[PDB]
Design a protein around this ligand. Structure first.
Ligand SMILES: [Zn+2]
Lengths: 16, 16
C-alpha cells in the first residue's frame, strides 16, 4: 500500500 | 498498490 498519500511523484512531487 | 515504485516523493521526487 501507498495511495493513501500517493498520487504520483516522479518529477512533479506528491500533489495531495 | 504503488509501493513497488513509492519510497516517498514529497520533497525529493521518487527514488524507487
Ligand atoms: Zn509516491
Amino acid at each position: 500500500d501507498a495511495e493513501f498519500g500517493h498520487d504520483s511523484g516522479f518529477e512533479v512531487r506528491h500533489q495531495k
